[PDB]
Amino acid sequence: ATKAVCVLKGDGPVQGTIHFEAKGDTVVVTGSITGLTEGDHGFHVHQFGDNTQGCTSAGPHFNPLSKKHGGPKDEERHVGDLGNVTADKNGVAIVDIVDPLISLSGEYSIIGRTMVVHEKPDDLGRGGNEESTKTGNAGSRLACGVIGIAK
Amino acid sequence: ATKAVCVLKGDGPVQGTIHFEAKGDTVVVTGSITGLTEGDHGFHVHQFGDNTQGCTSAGPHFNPLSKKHGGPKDEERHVGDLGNVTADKNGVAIVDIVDPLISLSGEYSIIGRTMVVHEKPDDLGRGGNEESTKTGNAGSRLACGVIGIAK
Ligand SMILES: [Cu+2]
Ligand SMILES: [Cu+2]
Ligand SMILES: [Zn+2]
Ligand SMILES: [Zn+2]
Numbered sequence A, B: 001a002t003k004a005v006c007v008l009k010g011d012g013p014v015q016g017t018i019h020f021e022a023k024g025d026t027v028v029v030t031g032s033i034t035g036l037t038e039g040d041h042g043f044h045v046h047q048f049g050d051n052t053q054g055c056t057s058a059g060p061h062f063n064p065l066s067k068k069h070g071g072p073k074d075e076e077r078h079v080g081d082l083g084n085v086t087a088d089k090n091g092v093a094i095v096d097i098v099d100p101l102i103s104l105s106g107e108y109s110i111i112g113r114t115m116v117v118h119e120k121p122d123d124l125g126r127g128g129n130e131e132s133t134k135t136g137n138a139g140s141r142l143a144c145g146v147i148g149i150a151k
Helices: A130-134
Strands: A003-008 A015-023 A026-034 A039-046 A052-055 A081-087 A093-099 A114-118 A141-146 B003-008 B015-023 B026-034 B039-046 B052-055 B081-087 B093-099 B114-118 B141-146
Touching: A003 A114, A015 A093, A015 A141, A026 A081, A039 A093, A052 A141, A081 A093, A141 B141, B003 B114, B015 B093, B015 B141, B026 B081, B039 B093, B052 B141, B081 B093
Parallel strands: none
Antiparallel strands: A003 A015, A003 A141, A015 A026, A026 A093, A039 A081, A039 A114, A114 A141, B003 B015, B003 B141, B015 B026, B026 B093, B039 B081, B039 B114, B114 B141
16 A cells, blocks of 8 residues: 565566555655666566566556656656666666656556566657657666565 | 455466455356366465465464364364365365355455465365474465455
């Protein structure tokens, strides 16, 4: 309801624990992802909490409003579009995102969906090519986990 | 949501995929678990979809009505009390459960909670000790996963 958690795992070395907390009409996303290459990595909620085929079965970006892909600060974005996390030289990205569109309740609830961190930076839907309007050219899914209710 | 899914894993060899489907006011639970010892094994929805410390962080049986532990056919049961799955001599359990109390939406939704399969049979709350009324003496948590929305 007010707190959620996600453990991201994959076939490679990328892992992390993400926490979610409802604050006013926002959700605060914190935690850290480890094992990344230094630099930016796309970071989105995908539609399905389905880990039967790794991160592949998570489906596309959570997009209940049928909008094009964007950055978290854009009006035109998927609900799940949380932009980029940035990993330091040691491969650690400290996640600190305050987002007004995702929710832990109601129609926009991300409970039971999947958090995904990507191989490449998210171009935030500015590129204008076809792939940018769906995924932001973030490339493959390095690690993922199902978003669960937390104590 | 009308469909849900769970991938079970643990520290040992126990693995399986559980599927959930809403039909009217019931949820149909199906799937398979391998790597179990022969015989019965407790099978419950636990409160938190928190895998940060393996199955230990899932918390207790999901219990919004503050009842004692029981079997799924009892009124005096936890919402998460789905009884026993049964593994054959080869360690394979076929899951086939129809339950009217768990739900995939609303107040008793198990989306974002944790499915857990246990070391020992669930005595269904009729073991005669204080432990029976809490866990059914199912023992340790062999494998678990967070319940996610499925396509
Ligand atoms: Cu993504
Ligand atoms: Cu249990
Ligand atoms: Zn997107
Ligand atoms: Zn119970």
